[PDB]
């Protein structure tokens, strides 16, 4: 909501509140500078054990 | 001056927490707080003005009786009655016999507590509780 | 005045004199607003404890710390280091500890001779402060009173003869209004 | 020295390091100057 | 080059928790205490220790390390100082909070004005977000204007069932400036009484809030509580936040920032060395106005009514605020 | 007499003391002449306020002024109030004594390097206890 | 104090092992990286119990990195001190300072306040040694120590014992 | 799992038993079942480390006096474990020097002894460990025990251990 | 683990999407640049992101994508499984 408008009002009533932010938007990983969960981000890539030793 | 520690002087009115312990060995009184300060590390010389005698911090141990004079009667007679115990019996009904034997005990328990000779004592009541 | 500015508010800081400010209305003159003085007993005796109590902790505590070691400190720096700080800083020869912003040997600290003096400190304080710990043991016993303005003017005994402040509390009529630590039980 | 400490909460073995923007960094400073308190944690608290 | 290696574990950020800093939390993670108004030493070749530049708190030169972390520049993060106020302060951005949860509860026993025995307050207690819930409960709250020591019991008007009260009318709290003004009314035998909500007053009934009231209010227990909007000890940013630039580097300029800390040292100073001795009673509220304003300039330059804090060019500061909104800001 | 908290920038590898540094401005870096190694990278080349430190010493101060929207009672109060300053009294007679020396130096069409000579001849000299019996228009005039 | 300790570690697979035999790799990463190495938490990990059933979870492949992050679950011997226990060790050096012992994988270090008076430092001595009426410290001997003080780092233990009780000392 | 801020922590002491917030008597397993804290005495951590040395040197192949014992920890040490094995190596060599029963039967017998008592785990682990002569020694080298077993069963208990123990 | 919906149960499209395609071909062509076993034979390629294509077309990319659900569910598809159709 702060990166809209109203920055430094919003941030004063999060911490009176203590609202607790999850970081799922874009502009909370955007702020935090880490993969935000869009697009190809939106799953995790995993390394398959069973799959390994079948391709030798 | 009956309710204070003798070395800090912690008074029970501003420290109504403070608990005194005593030492059998010279049965001095000594608030818990000045305990663990002064032997929480190991074995030290008791303080007060006039003792010398070490002790060890685990032999304290609170009053009961609020004479220190009986408490060194009564510990020294738990000592004694330690190794001196006898009943009716063991002399079979001679009251005579047990008569005596009480005051031998008795006996033992006054010359060890004023120390009239205590190493002749000390020694006597170290070869019984051997038998 | 001037003088009189440091005495009345420390004074006032330690809670043994107490203030009250009341408009006045002279017949003559426009209206000033006075300041009296006075002793509120219940907090002067509240103050006086604990801080009886505190100096007395505060020599208890600082005895007890006197027992523990010494420590260490770095001559340069002027850092402290305690002895658990001060073990894992030593070099690789493993003979003098190391500093860690100056990498120099430390020096150890003092205190280690005090551990009689703040003894005979306490000692000296116990003695000198009996009369206080008298007077608060009677003090207990009995139930005070808390003073205020009106009722100390009960026992008023006038300083001057034509004094310009009006030693009366003509309280407004009828006011709700109230004011912090004005109103006692 | 491989040491760290968190002074005022007396713990040397809960510690974690991000990567965040300089500017992010710059930025909770800020508000902690300002008395807000945001607090970075590393684990969820509610449910998703 | 990059770096340092770090034996710490890495891990991404889950979640952001926001609060208040609590007076003792700001001791306890300063690293050190700023006593002294000035930057420099008399020699302006190293930065005076317990200044505000004070090397302890971190470093923003090339070729000097952190006295505390013993780090470069690019590997300090900055540490963070304290400076003890002589006497509270409101936040500027709490203020008008501040009045809205000063007329919810009673200010002589800190209490809520209407408890549960009311219909109405029910339902407002009922309502779960929080921000909802503080508006309903301040709507009902606002216009009570007396404790009530008594309260007529739900079951029957004919009896009263008492509660937790003191009789006390309640004022109509108004903001001047940056001071929050109670006046009260008293009944008919006419002029209504005045006087100024003191800042330590405040923060004192702000104390007797109990846990269930101010949670009833939207405020967290463990985070934010209504008493720390009040501020005691002042959180000093470190260096990085406030660096200090050079144009030709034979002159020394600095941030905004740290002359409005000056500002607050020096104010700060000037009210302890008043209240120490003598100060009359109206020079210790000019005084106490000034750290006032200095505070909420520096977190706030931008308030509707109040002065500008302008530099010696005469433009104005630029405060946190000002840093973080706009087009051109943090965020 | 303090912390040397004092870094020297050498290459690891060359091992060369002094070192032949070389600053990219440009690209940022702090690069080792000999082999290359670069030693340090992101390299840093109005949010602030022009000092002076040498006629001003360390003085930090700040005015109060009217802005968009003011109501006249609180910039009156406000300037009241940081005028009875103890500490900042004793820095305003120099500052006082430099406004004098300015409009003296100014009236005389003077440079300004005549003036900026004038204030620092003024303090370097001021509060000293030889001239304390002189009268301070002779001093004005000694620095001019 | 030795103890048996359920843990877990996140291990990180360079992609150059990502080959049909590397599960193996995992198994020799965790003896090269937790064999032998010290913990303020869980203290001195000193032995892998049950090698042959370590639990090895998915590895989950790091966006930039391209490493898979493994999560490993094994059961292990730890070594972890604390305050008030009694030890024997070794006196592995001695100085002005003080003589510390070696207690496993640990040095307890003993400094002269936390010594009985008696005991005084002789350096004329080769080697220096600690020297008192009815026994002399000197490297190699045996030493009852007990731990009066731990500091845990996150990767390193440092600790603090004392002799002045009774029953301590020289063994 | 909300409220993560400081709260006030017992201090690691091991003479009021307050081994941590890690180390508590109760702990779960990875399957997630309830178990007792395992502390080994110095002669149990000897077996328990050897039995998976031997084990960790069958897999790998497969797919006493001190003196001479200590040699043969030696190369069995350096053989079985990795790189970096500096602390291992100590502690193997600490054990074999100090440790006081030597195979399974003795120390089998000296857990089925001392397990009687209902004892902490972690003060049990201290009685195999140290070897105390008369019960004030053993009271005041592990002051947990007191107020916990009486004088008369803490006698036979040391006795009957060295009495259990040959070297 | 409430959060593994089983294999019998997955109710998700069984066709790679484009990020998905996108991210594994990039994830395995970074393997691919430091040194990782290459699964595939290879008639002449230099370039990474070539060598995971061809990968990718005869099915040997070993990963299985974790598609989330925004209850916090997820469920495994392995590359191998996933249709390649887009
Ligand atoms: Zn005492
Ligand atoms: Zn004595
Ligand atoms: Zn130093
Ligand atoms: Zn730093
Ligand atoms: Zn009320
Ligand atoms: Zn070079």
């Known amino acids: 909501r702060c990166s809209f408008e109203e920055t430094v009002e919003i941030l004063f009533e999060a911490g009176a509140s203590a609202e607790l932010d ?5 502009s909370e990983n955007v702020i935090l500078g880490q993969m935000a969960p869009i697009g190809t981000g939106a799953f995790d890539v995993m390394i398959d054990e069973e799959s390994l030793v079948k391709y030798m | 001056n009956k309710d204070m520690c003798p070395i800090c002087k912690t008074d029970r009115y501003l420290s109504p927490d403070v608990k005194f312990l005593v030492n059998p060995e010279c049965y001095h009184r000594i608030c818990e707080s000045c305990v663990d300060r002064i032997f929480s590390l190991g074995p030290a010389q008791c303080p007060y003005k006039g003792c010398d005698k070490i002790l060890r911090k685990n032999k304290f141990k609170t009053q009961i009786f609020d004479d220190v004079e009986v408490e060194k009667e009564v510990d020294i007679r738990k000592r004694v009655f330690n190794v001196f115990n006898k009943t009716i019996d063991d002399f079979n009904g001679d009251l005579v016999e047990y008569n005596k034997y009480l005051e031998e005990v008795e006996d033992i328990i006054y010359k060890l507590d004023h120390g009239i000779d205590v190493a002749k004592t000390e020694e006597k009541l170290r070869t019984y509780e051997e038998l | 005045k001037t003088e009189l500015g440091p005495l009345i508010a420390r004074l006032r800081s ?80 493993r003979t003098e500890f190391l500093c860690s912003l100056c990498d120099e040997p430390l020096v150890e600290d003092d205190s280690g001779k005090k551990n009689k003096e703040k003894q005979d400190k306490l000692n000296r304080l116990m003695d000198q402060i009996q009369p206080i710990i008298d007077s608060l043991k009677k003090i207990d016993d009995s139930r005070i009173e808390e003073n205020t303005f009106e009722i100390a003017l009960a026992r008023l005994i006038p300083p001057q003869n034509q004094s310009h402040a009006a030693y009366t509390y003509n309280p407004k009529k009828g006011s709700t209004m109230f004011r912090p630590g004005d109103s006692a039980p | 020295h491989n040491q760290f400490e968190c002074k005022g909460c007396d713990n040397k073995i809960d510690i974690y390091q991000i990567h965040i923007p300089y500017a992010a960094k710059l930025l909770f400073q800020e508000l902690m100057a300002m008395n807000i308190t945001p607090r970075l944690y590393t684990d969820r608290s509610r449910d998703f | 080059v990059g770096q340092q290696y770090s034996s710490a574990p890495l891990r991404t950020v889950k979640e952001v928790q926001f609060g208040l800093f609590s007076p003792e939390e700001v001791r306890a993670i300063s690293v050190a205490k700023i006593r002294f108004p000035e930057t420099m030493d008399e020699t302006q070749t190293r930065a005076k220790i317990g200044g505000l530049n004070d090397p302890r708190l971190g470093s923003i030169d090339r070729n000097l390390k952190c006295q505390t972390c013993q780090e470069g520049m690019n590997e300090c993060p900055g540490h963070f100082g304290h400076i003890d106020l002589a006497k509270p302060v409101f936040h500027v951005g709490f203020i008008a909070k501040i009045k809205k949860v000063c007329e919810c509860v009673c200010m002589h026993c800190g209490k ?51 509660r937790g009260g003191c009789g006390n009318t309640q004022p109509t709290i108004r903001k001047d400036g940056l001071k929050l003004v109670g006046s009260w009314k008293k009944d008919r035998a006419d002029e209504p009484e005045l006087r100024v909500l003191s800042t330590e007053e405040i923060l004192n009934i702000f104390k007797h809030i109990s846990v269930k009231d101010f949670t009833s209010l939207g405020f967290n227990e463990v985070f934010s509580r209504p008493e720390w909007m009040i501020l005691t000890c002042l959180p000093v940013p470190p260096p990085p936040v406030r660096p200090s630039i050079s ?82 800001g943090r965020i | 007499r303090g912390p040397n908290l004092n870094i020297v920038l050498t290459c690891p590898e060359c091992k060369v003391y002094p070192p032949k540094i070389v600053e990219r401005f440009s690209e940022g870096d702090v690069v080792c002449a000999l082999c290359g190694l670069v030693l340090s990278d992101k ?7 022009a000092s002076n430190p040498l006629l001003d010493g360390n003085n930090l101060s700040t005015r109060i002024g009217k802005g968009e929207t003011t109501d006249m009672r609180f910039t009156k109060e406000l300037n009241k109030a940081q005028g009875k300053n103890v500490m900042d009294k004793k820095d305003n007679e120099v500052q006082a004594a430099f406004a004098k020396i300015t409009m003296l130096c100014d009236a005389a069409e003077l440079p300004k390097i005549v003036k900026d000579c004038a204030k620092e001849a003024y303090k370097l000299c001021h509060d000293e206890k030889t001239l304390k019996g002189k009268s301070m228009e002779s001093i004005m005039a000694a620095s001019i | 104090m030795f103890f048996i300790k359920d843990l877990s570690l996140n291990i990180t697979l360079h992609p150059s092992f990502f080959g049909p035999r590397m599960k193996q790799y995992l198994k020799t990463k965790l003896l090269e990286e937790v064999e032998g190495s010290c913990t303020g938490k869980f203290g001195y990990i000193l032995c892998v119990l049950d090698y042959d059933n370590i639990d090895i979870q998915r590895g989950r492949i790091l966006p930039t990195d391209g490493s898979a992050e493994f999560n490993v679950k094994y059961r292990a011997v730890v070594f972890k001190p604390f305050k008030g226990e009694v030890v024997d060790g070794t006196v592995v050096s001695c100085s002005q300072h003080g003589f510390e012992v070696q207690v496993g994988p640990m040095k307890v270090f003993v400094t002269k306040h936390l010594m009985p008076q008696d005991l005084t430092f002789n350096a004329g001595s080769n080697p220096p040694s600690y020297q008192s009426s009815e026994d002399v410290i000197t490297i190699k001997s045996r030493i009852r120590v007990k731990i009066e003080g731990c500091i845990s780092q996150v990767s390193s233990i440092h600790a603090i014992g004392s002799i002045k009780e009774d029953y301590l000392g020289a063994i | 799992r909300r409220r993560r801020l400081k709260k006030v922590e017992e201090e690691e002491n091991a003479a009021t038993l307050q081994l941590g917030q890690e180390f508590q008597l109760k702990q779960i397993n990875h399957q997630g079942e309830e178990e007792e804290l395992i502390a080994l005495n110095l002669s149990e951590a000897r077996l328990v480390i050897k039995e998976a040395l031997v084990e960790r040197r069958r897999a790998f192949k497969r797919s006493e006096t001190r003196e001479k014992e200590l040699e043969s920890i030696d190369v069995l040490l350096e053989q079985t474990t990795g790189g970096n094995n500096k ?28 397990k009687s008592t209902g004892l902490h ?4 682990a201290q009685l195999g460990s140290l070897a105390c002569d008369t019960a004030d020694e053993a009271k005041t080298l592990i002051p947990s025990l007191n107020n916990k077993i009486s004088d008369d069963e803490l006698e036979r208990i040391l006795k009957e251990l060295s009495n259990l123990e040959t070297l | ?67 989330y659900l925004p209850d916090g569910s997820f469920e495994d598809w392995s590359v191998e499984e996933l249709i390649v159709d887009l």
Not at chain 5, 124 to 147: E, G, H, P, Y
Not at chain 5, 269 to 279: D, Q, R
Request: glycine share 4%.
């Open chain 9, 1 to 67: 683990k409430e959060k593994a919906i089983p294999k019998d149960q997955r109710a998700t499209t069984p066709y790679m999407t484009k990020y998905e395609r996108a991210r594994i071909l990039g994830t395995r062509a970074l393997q691919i640049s430091m040194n990782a076993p290459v699964f595939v034979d290879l008639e002449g390629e230099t370039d990474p992101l070539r060598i995971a294509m061809k990968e990718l077309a005869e099915k040997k990319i070993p990963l299985v994508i974790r598609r």
């Open chain 8, 121 to 124: 785990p972690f003060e049990v």
């Open chain 8, 87 to 114: 602390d291992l190596k100590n502690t193997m060599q600490y054990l074999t020097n100090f440790s006081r029963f030597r195979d399974q039967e003795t120390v089998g017998a000296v857990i089925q002894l001392l």
């Open chain 5, 112 to 162: 809520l004005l209407l408890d549960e025995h009311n219909e109405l307050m029910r339902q407002a207690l009922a309502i779960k977000d929080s921000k909802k819930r503080f508006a309903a409960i301040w709507t009902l709250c606002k216009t009570k204007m007396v404790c009530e020591t008594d309260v007529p019991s739900e079951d029957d008007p004919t009896q009263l069932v008492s």
């Open chain 5, 247 to 328: 144009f030709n580097e034979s002159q020394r300029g600095e941030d905004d920032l740290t002359f409005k800390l000056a500002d607050i040292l020096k104010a700060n100073i000037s009210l302890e060395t008043l209240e120490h001795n003598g100060a009359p009673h109206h020079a210790i509220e000019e005084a106490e106005s000034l750290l006032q304003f200095h505070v909420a300039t520096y977190m706030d330059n931008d308030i509707a009514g109040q002065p500008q804090a302008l530099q010696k060019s005469g433009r104005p500061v630029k405060s946190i605020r000002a840093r973080l909104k706009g087009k051109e």
């Open chain 3, 14 to 93: 330690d809670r043994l004199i107490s203030i009250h400010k009341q408009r006045e209305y002279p017949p003559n003159s426009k209206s000033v607003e006075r300041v009296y003085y006075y002793v509120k007993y219940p907090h002067a005796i509240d103050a006086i404890k604990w801080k009886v109590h505190q100096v007395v902790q505060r020599l208890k505590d600082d005895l007890d710390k006197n027992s523990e070691p010494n420590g260490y400190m770095c001559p340069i720096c002027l850092t402290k280091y305690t002895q658990l700080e001060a073990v894992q800083l030593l070099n690789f020869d």
């Open chain 6, 43 to 49: 390299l840093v080349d109005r949010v602030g306020e």
């Open chain 1, 22 to 26: 999850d970081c799922r938007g874009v």
